[PDB]
Chains A and B, each alone.
Chain A
Amino acid sequence: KSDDVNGRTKMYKNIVDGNHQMEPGMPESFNVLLKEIRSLGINIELED
Chain B
Amino acid sequence: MKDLLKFLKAQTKTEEFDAIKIALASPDMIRSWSFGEVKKPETINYRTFKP
Residues of A within 8 A of B23 (CB): 42-45
List the A side residues contacting B25 at CB < 8 Å: 38, 40-43
Chain B residue total in the interface (Cβ 8 A): 15
Total contacts A to B, CB within 8 angstroms? 43
Contact A43 B24 (CB under 8 A): yes
Are the C-beta atoms of B19 and A48 separated by less than 8 Å? yes
Q: How large is the interface on A (under 10, 10 to 19, 20 to 34, 35 or more residues)?
A: 10 to 19
Question: Chain B, 6-22, contact with A by CB distance < 8 Å: what is the 0/1 string?
Answer: 00001001100111111
In the bound assembly, the distance between CA atoms of A48 and B21 in angstroms comes to 10
- Asked whether A6 is an interface residue with its Cβ less than 8 Å from the other chain, the reply is yes
Contact among B17, B20, B22 with A42 in the assembled complex (CB-CB below 8 Å): B22
A16 an interface residue at 8 Å Cβ cutoff?
Answer: no
Q: Is A46 an interface residue (CB 8 A)?
A: yes
Q: Interface of B with A (CB < 8 Å)? A: 10, 13-14, 17-25, 29-30, 33
